Amino acid sequence: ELMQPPSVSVSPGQTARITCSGDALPKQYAYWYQQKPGQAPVLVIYKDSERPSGIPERFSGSSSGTTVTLTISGVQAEDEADYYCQSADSSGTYVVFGGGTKLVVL
Amino acid sequence: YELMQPPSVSVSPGQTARITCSGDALPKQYAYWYQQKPGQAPVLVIYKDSERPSGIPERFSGSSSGTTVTLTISGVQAEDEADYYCQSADSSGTYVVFGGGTKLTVL
Amino acid sequence: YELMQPPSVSVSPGQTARITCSGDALPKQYAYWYQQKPGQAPVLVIYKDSERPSGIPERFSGSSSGTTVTLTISGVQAEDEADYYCQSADSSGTYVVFGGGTKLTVL
Amino acid sequence: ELMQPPSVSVSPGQTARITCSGDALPKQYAYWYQQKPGQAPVLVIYKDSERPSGIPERFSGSSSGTTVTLTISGVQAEDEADYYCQSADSSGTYVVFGGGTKLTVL
Numbered sequence: 001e002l003m004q005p006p007s008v009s010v011s012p013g014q015t016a017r018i019t020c021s022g023d024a025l026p027k028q029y030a031y032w033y034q035q036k037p038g039q040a041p042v043l044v045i046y047k048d049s050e051r052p053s054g055i056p057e058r059f060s061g062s063s064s065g066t067t068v069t070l071t072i073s074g075v076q077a078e079d080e081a082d083y084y085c086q087s088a089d090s091s092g093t094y095v096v097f098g099g100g101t102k103l104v105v106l
Numbered sequence: 107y108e109l110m111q112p113p114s115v116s117v118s119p120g121q122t123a124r125i126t127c128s129g130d131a132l133p134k135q136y137a138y139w140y141q142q143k144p145g146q147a148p149v150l151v152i153y154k155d156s157e158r159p160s161g162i163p164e165r166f167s168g169s170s171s172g173t174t175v176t177l178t179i180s181g182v183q184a185e186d187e188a189d190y191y192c193q194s195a196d197s198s199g200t201y202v203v204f205g206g207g208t209k210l211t212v213l
Numbered sequence: 214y215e216l217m218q219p220p221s222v223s224v225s226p227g228q229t230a231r232i233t234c235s236g237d238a239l240p241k242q243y244a245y246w247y248q249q250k251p252g253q254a255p256v257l258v259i260y261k262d263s264e265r266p267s268g269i270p271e272r273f274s275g276s277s278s279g280t281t282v283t284l285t286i287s288g289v290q291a292e293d294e295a296d297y298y299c300q301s302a303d304s305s306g307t308y309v310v311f312g313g314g315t316k317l318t319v320l
Numbered sequence: 321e322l323m324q325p326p327s328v329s330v331s332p333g334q335t336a337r338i339t340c341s342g343d344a345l346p347k348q349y350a351y352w353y354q355q356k357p358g359q360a361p362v363l364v365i366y367k368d369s370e371r372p373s374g375i376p377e378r379f380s381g382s383s384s385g386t387t388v389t390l391t392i393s394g395v396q397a398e399d400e401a402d403y404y405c406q407s408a409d410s411s412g413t414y415v416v417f418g419g420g421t422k423l424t425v426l
């Protein structure tokens with residue numbers, strides 16, 4: 001299980017940082033996706049720091065020991081969504097998730 | 107939905123299901139696949155066309171062919187009943203595109 | 214899904230679409246209907262079989278026949294393209310049941 | 321539209337209160353539903369205070385002036401979800417929503 005804050009809120013154009021923590025993160029890749037009702041999930045970062053095509057450069061990913069972090073610079077209204085981190089247990093046998101973080105733009 | 111995906115695919119347990127998405131930009135743009143079950147976080151099952159994240163069973167596999175990508179689920183089990191989504195980017199690689207989702211019914 | 218609902222219904226603009234859910238407990242249990250568009254909050258469009266919350270257009274209407282309930286959308290507009298969900302309760306009225314959702318495609 | 325806190329978190333068995341504010345609420349009904357990925361929305365309260373069949377008694381709704389409130393007594397793990405209030409503008413012409421509140425059970 002991964003620990004993630006329930007919500008992060010920032011005013012427009014601020015940077016938001018969303019961190020997940022977990023014992024297995026030092027040895028397991030994380031994936032970050034954006035969840036909105038009614039549409040496919042949108043992968044914003046894979047393997048800790050890689051960005052899929054079509055994803056704005058303002059989205060970036062980093063990792064440090066038992067944490068991984070999605071940073072969103074210059075937050076826009078369309079960024080309002082839930083962000084989930086996905087990884088795997090220490091053994092790499094099964095998928096593990098954070099509880100999701102709701103990003104609000106004040 | 108700029109990717110064309112059938113709304114429904116059904117198979118009995120043990121069969122292999124193939125879920126396809128179609129789009130003009132798929133040849134030179136990676137696809138990503140998700141599984142969505144009721145009341146659970148979505149799961150990334152394939153990225154970059156064919157790679158599985160740690161923890162994803164090998165019975166899930168992705169492939170690319172012309173203007174179509176395919177999620178193939180071998181030996182479908184009851185618990186695989188879920189919605190499956192595909193994501194990619196447009197021909198330029200400037201914005202994300204996605205299919206409407208396929209409901210996989212088992213039985 | 215203890216209610217059964219077609220995964221897909223399609224009509225051209227201006228037509229009337231009928232989306233149906235079926236279940237043994239529907240006769241003596243109210244149904245509720247939602248509209249889900251991409252990237253937006255779900256919308257309650259019908260409650261108690263046939264009542265429309267304030268702000269829902271009269272072109273959306275709900276009805277109830279035997280073991281089926283029906284969301285009828287008259288004068289379908291392109292912006293009505295969405296997923297539609299039905300919810301009710303079991304026979305006794307002890308827990309909630311749902312359909313798998315219908316994708317309405319507007320041609 | 322409507323103002324709702326981004327998130328509410330309580331330990332198991334506590335009571336959670338989720339409030340929506342809006343100028344038109346004194347004259348317009350509110351509806352509360354539970355949103356989870358992958359499933360139909362679940363209406364827990366309609367017309368301010370009425371509960372659909374199949375909804376546990378621990379869910380209740382109240383209204384007071386420019387506010388409406390969903391109260392969840394004895395919060396349980398399956399209650400973890402987003403809760404949205406829906407209403408209508410002052411004229412009753414168009415639908416309005418809160419931004420959703422993510423309920424976390426610590």
Ligand SMILES: OC[C@@]1(O)CC[C@@H]([C@@H]2CC[C@](O)(CO)CO2)OC1
Pocket residue numbers: 035036037038039040041142148249255355356357358359360361
């Ligand atoms: O109102 C229906 C939904 O609850 C279905 C799923 C949920 C989203 C919609 C589809 C989803 O994003 C696909 O991963 C999963 O969660 O929002 C709306």
